[PDB]
Design a protein around this ligand. Structure first.
Ligand SMILES: COc1cc(CCc2cc(NC(=O)c3ccc(N4C[C@@H](C)N[C@@H](C)C4)cc3)[nH]n2)cc(OC)c1
Length: 282
């Protein structure tokens, strides 16, 4: 790997900590970076570090590098997982990125379900219920991250609550944008055609995940029937606790004709307005 002084951090500035989550983003560990900012060399910053597994292949290395390089080009946004640095010399490739201490959006929401036969809270460490405004805001932030990525001509291909991470301060950050059928637009599923419009379809499913507090889409519908049923016009019913307006947004995201779906730009404007009008008492 050739050096890139723009991003390089010396290996001994990282204090490698524990594995994060359960490997959904590869082998990622929590770490402390000493002097990640050259301006503040005596500060430690909690970061996430991605590296290769032990019995990796030449494919895995090229993918990690490709991921890193794409993230270098993508630029910063507060609602995406940002690249912070890399250790490419004198040892294994480390890709240093932002740390999101509250985990993926699905588990985040599930843990915040009311303590319920209908919608069961699987966490042994449940957390305070989210207000109705918090929930719309979570949708708005995801949309903002996607609006940014789409503006940089990035197609995600796997947008879903599990690929949004939540920081200590409850900021939503899109993950895994740098290199499942129940989140795919019919045209992606059928014909392998991935676009910003198919990401919008996925966003609709993600909205449904939000308003079911981490519910599993198309409950009990076998994968092998799903494209057939989507072709026939099957769409998820409204979550029990969802406004008609947010449901209509989901439905629009699931337009059969890709050109008729809203853009992320429009979704952001729409969610911005909905967030403003959502009661902060409920
Ligand atoms: C482009 O995209 C990425 C994303 C990443 C992942 C970076 C990352 C991962 C995390 N974080 C966790 O993975 C995490 C943290 C806490 C979790 N939980 C466990 C849960 C049971 N309780 C909860 C209270 C907390 C569960 C998961 N931050 N940054 C790496 C990357 O390389 C290049 C690129």
């Amino acid at each position: 790997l050739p050096e890139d002084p723009r991003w390089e951090l010396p290996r001994d500035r990282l204090v490698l900590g524990k594995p994060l989550g359960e490997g959904a983003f590869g082998q990622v560990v929590l770490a402390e970076a000493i002097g990640l900012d050259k301006d503040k060399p005596n500060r430690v910053t909690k970061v996430a570090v991605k590296m290769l597994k032990s019995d990796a292949t030449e494919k895995d290395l090229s993918d990690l590098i490709s991921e890193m390089e794409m993230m270098k080009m993508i630029g910063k946004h507060k609602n995406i997982i940002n690249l912070l640095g890399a250790c490419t010399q004198d040892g294994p490739l480390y890709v240093i990125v932002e740390y999101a201490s509250k985990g993926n959006l699905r588990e985040y929401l599930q843990a915040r379900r009311p303590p319920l036969e209908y919608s069961y809270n699987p966490s042994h460490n449940p957390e305070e219920q989210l207000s109705s405004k918090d929930l719309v805001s979570c949708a708005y932030q995801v949309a903002r991250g996607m609006e940014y990525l789409a503006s940089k001509k990035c197609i995600h291909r796997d947008l879903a609550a599990r690929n949004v991470l939540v920081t200590e301060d409850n900021v939503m950050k899109i993950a895994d944008f740098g290199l499942p059928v129940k989140w795919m637009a019919p045209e992606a599923l059928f014909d392998r055609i991935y676009t910003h419009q198919s990401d919008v379809w996925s966003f609709g499913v993600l909205l449904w995940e939000i308003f079911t507090l981490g519910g599993s889409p198309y409950p009990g519908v076998p994968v092998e029937e799903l494209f057939k049923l989507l072709k026939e016009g099957h769409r998820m019913d409204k979550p029990s606790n969802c406004t008609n307006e947010l449901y209509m947004m989901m439905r629009d995201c699931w337009h059969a004709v890709p050109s008729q779906r809203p853009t992320f730009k429009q979704l952001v404007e729409d969610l911005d307005r909905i967030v403003a009008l959502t009661s902060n008492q409920e």
